[model samples]
Target: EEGKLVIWINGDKGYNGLAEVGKKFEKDTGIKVTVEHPDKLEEKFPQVAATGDGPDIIFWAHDRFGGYAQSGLLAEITPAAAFQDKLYPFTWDAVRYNGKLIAYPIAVEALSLIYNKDLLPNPPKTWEEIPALDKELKAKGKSALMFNLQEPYFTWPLIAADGGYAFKYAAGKYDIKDVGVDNAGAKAGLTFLVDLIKNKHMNADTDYSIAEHAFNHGETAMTINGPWAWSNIDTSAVNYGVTVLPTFKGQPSKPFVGVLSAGINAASPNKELAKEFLENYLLTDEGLEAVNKDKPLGAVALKSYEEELVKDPRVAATMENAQKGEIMPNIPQMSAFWYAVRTAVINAASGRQTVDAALAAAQTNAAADLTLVCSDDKSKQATLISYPVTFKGHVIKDMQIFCKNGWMQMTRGRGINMIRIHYPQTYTSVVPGACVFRGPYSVPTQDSIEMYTVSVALLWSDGTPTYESLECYVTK
Candidate 1:
């Protein structure tokens, strides 16, 4: 009867459910709604929008919205005042950037303690006793709380429970200058983590796959993961129970909360219709209940719809865990935090450095990089290299890099090629400069290490790269 409103989704259990419901949207509004399953919304959506052709709505995690909103790629959305009351604070805050709403948060995400109930009556309520259970569980070939131990995102709650935080809340928002990765509490958390690898019977090599297979095959009794990983388990094969992750030191393990959201393309021709669908029909109780019938990602913003979600043990634990989480900071600067902390944690776990020293060095380096980038200082080239560490010798043939913006040449002689970076992807609209082109990393010889530089600079009015800071680090 009318035109179409297209959307891209993950095509999980929710995909067909969303499409089935979109048929209802079409019938009610005289607008046909269709779905496309595409991967890499992180890179694809912006590229498609840059060409001015894509779906009217794109559903994905809210973390990407900060950069897209900053790039002017999303239509601003300010839901009705009543709609604000429907979601939890984190999900509500997730859809807004630079103090404006730009998307509709669909489902909240958080870490939960997923356990095979047939083996354990109830998951442990605290963290200290976990190691003691290791031998007992392992006697039965079961693990107590296996996860990606060195991963900062998965381990953040352990840090948070010890009173450490990424950034202190200042005024109304995060104080980016006050990085907290190396505080005393963080140190304690790190120590506890290392003890597991060194002293406990827990497997040091446990990855997502290892943990998932162990739980599904009934080898492990418990693991800590989020809602997204629950769908694969055949409930018939392993009876599971879901509960909040245990406390770290009498305080709750507070994971960073995230939400999956849907936003309108700023360039979409159907802005009004898209908004209408999101605000009224798609967000309604009936629409969300239908989506949850296939599976629960959490819940729609509507609390009444969420009533059913809390009834399922898995979904209930997720929502309860979500209540204990800190909203993941959704700012462009947050892009710089992940890789730094993760590398630091891995280095500590791998014995590259003492946990405390590694964390301190990582935090200090991060602060310096954030300082240069946040200020966009673009000072003279000589002064900007912050912590430049050069590898005295390289296995020449084994390492290299070529840059187009600055230091545009390549090769192996003492030149210090660098990296595995995750920040530059979010800097699409940032003025191109030395800082924008994340520094090098190819030094991977058996005896050698991967050393990457974190440089920050600005594009001068003349467009010359004015480097505010250029610093490097090398590790094996």
Candidate 2:
């Protein structure tokens, strides 16, 4: 039958579900099915889509597919209007882009506050209250936030929950034209982050692995993470609790939701059959059951599973909190926003700037990039400039500069005293022999403090340090 379908799944663990569904579909509807796994889906998917030789169906993260749709690589799936009412509002909302339904959502990943119940008798309800809780925990010398500074994804949510959104949404779409890096909400969030670091309320030392291990080992009392941590964490050792993320003055800190869905190739030879398979396999009781058995996350088709499937007190609490969650935007401009936000955050937390300065520079740069127009005229070409500069005794890393017409026009980086600095309209010719640096560094010690003069120096184009310098210091 022309209804035969070929599917490619991303997860190695998904084989069992595919086989089960394939067997049932073949037996009942006579449609043959095949599933394959490509080594690196993110890298390979774009290539496959470009060639129009990819499988008729593929399983991927909803966020990842956003790029595919914007690039005109994937087909739109308009499910029978009936499926809309049966699905979770959040899950359904995540699959649509620009008024078009792009994929059949299968599972959702949302974040919540996961804590050690034994230590926190009462968890803070709002993020503003976290500082007090952090202080109390530090007084007792307990871990208040179990996280790693290197993990931006985990840290950004804290800021988001405090009414800080990475990209502002307007008119049913994200307004990438403006970057909100230095918004008041973002500053509040970063301020809390810096305080956590200074007071030792959070463990920034642990990578994701070590952070989870610390939680399981009872070293940390609380952390903000998602379901993936559920299995790895030792629930047997202590009374663990989960709740929706804390808010800030009643404004919800919406965690970014990563949706996984089934997408059909726009150029697939069997587009109709592929769509049918998606509609049948993604929404059926058996399909939902297979997803539950295979993934066990929140299924897209909420109708198939009993309440008990998601009824665990912790799971329910997380879901309830997730109602305020926001689906990450699939817009192409998102990549630039991620880089800009992350750079700004790292700078702010590392004390490169007052939270205000760091986020402001970040927001400005993001907005400019979002509104950037590509030009073919050589005189109007734009380029990104980033290098290292020595200001005082401190090595300022990854100082970013944007250049136009062979002149540096915009500059962003942390000053030696940890202040985020931005020069939006500066002409590069005005600052000849200036050097820009961008990289991570070690925390300064008292012994080294004397040598730190908080000055800036230029690096020669050949990558050698120049003798010229500028003086700057941390604000009192």
List clash counts for every candidate, in order: 10, 25
lDDT of 2 by residue, 265-361 (tens): 8878788877766667656777766755654554244655635557666567666765787778766555556666776667666665556645654
Best model per lDDT = 1
Model 1: per-residue Cα lDDT over 1-476, one tens digit each: 12679888765437776787888888887788888888755568877986787889988778677767766789988777777787666577788887799899888878888888888886789888888887788777666767876557787788778877776778887765567887888888877887887875555566677777777888777888877666666453877877888898898898888788899999888998888887776787777766665556764556777776767777777878878878777665454466568776786777665676567656755543322222222221212223221122111122112232344322333223333222333444644333333533554342354333443433322333333233333342
Model 1 / residue 171 / CA error / Å: 1.5
User: What is every candidate's alpha-carbon RMSD to the true fold?
Assistant: 10.8, 11.1
lDDT of each: 0.67, 0.60
* TM-score, per-candidate, Cα-based: 0.71, 0.66
Residue 261 of candidate 2: its Cα lDDT? 79
**Compared to the true structure, candidate 1 yields what TM-score?**
0.71
Tally clashes: model 1.
Answer: 10
Indicate which candidate wins on TM-score.
Answer: 1
